[PDB]
Amino acid sequence: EELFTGVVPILVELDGDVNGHKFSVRGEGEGDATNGKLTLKFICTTGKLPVPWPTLVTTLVQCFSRYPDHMKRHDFFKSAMPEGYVQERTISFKDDGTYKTRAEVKFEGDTLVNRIELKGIDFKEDGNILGHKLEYNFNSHNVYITADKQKNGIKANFKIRHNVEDGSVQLADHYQQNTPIGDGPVLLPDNHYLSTQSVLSKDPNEKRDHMVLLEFVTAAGITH
Ligand code: NA
Ligand code: NA
Ligand code: NA
What we know:
By secondary structure, the chain is mostly beta strands. The chain has 1 helix and 11 strands, in the order βββαββββββββ. The protein has one domain: Green Fluorescent Protein (Beta Barrel), CATH 2.40.155.10. Strands 1-2-3-11-10-7-8-9-4-5-6 form an 11-stranded mixed barrel. Strand 2 (about 20-30) and strand 3 form a beta hairpin. One sodium ion (NA) binds near residues 204 and 205. It holds the Pfam family GFP.
């Protein structure tokens, strides 16, 4: 919490396997929780990414959300720091495959590190994911968080809306659970949500398959 007062370096490491296609992503940048802001560049270090970059955005550090003062009692993510938390998700792409992800989010020295294993199964070879038919952009979402007292953690549920190149929308249902790594006490929040926004771009000097991401997230849903 006091660990987030300024700008914090971020490292993201993802190992993925989707319908047997193996890939790795490495991301580097910084987080400014005071303003809810993330600035990162991600590289596919194994060559071509076999799924669209937008499908990995949510997997690729909610401790950088801005929690307003009146919500300070509800910030599980920072309260678990520095020892961190496990973040697990199931992502269900409507009429296509699923991702299962397990990550650890924790400080390693001065750097906030998100280390992820992703397994994707049951994707259509000519669907929107393996067929690379999703637009290179991101919509603004609401991440609904609830406490899971018995697990000493939280759950989240939300839908990601991926614009498709034919003008339709590909929904991705997100089920999420977070548990602390360490033994120290954490905050168990009242129901609230994170309001998100982001933009995806390219670095014209970067020849590797990559994504530049700028993201802003603020907590809300508890009136002062
Ligand atoms: Na509390
Ligand atoms: Na659910
Ligand atoms: Na240039």
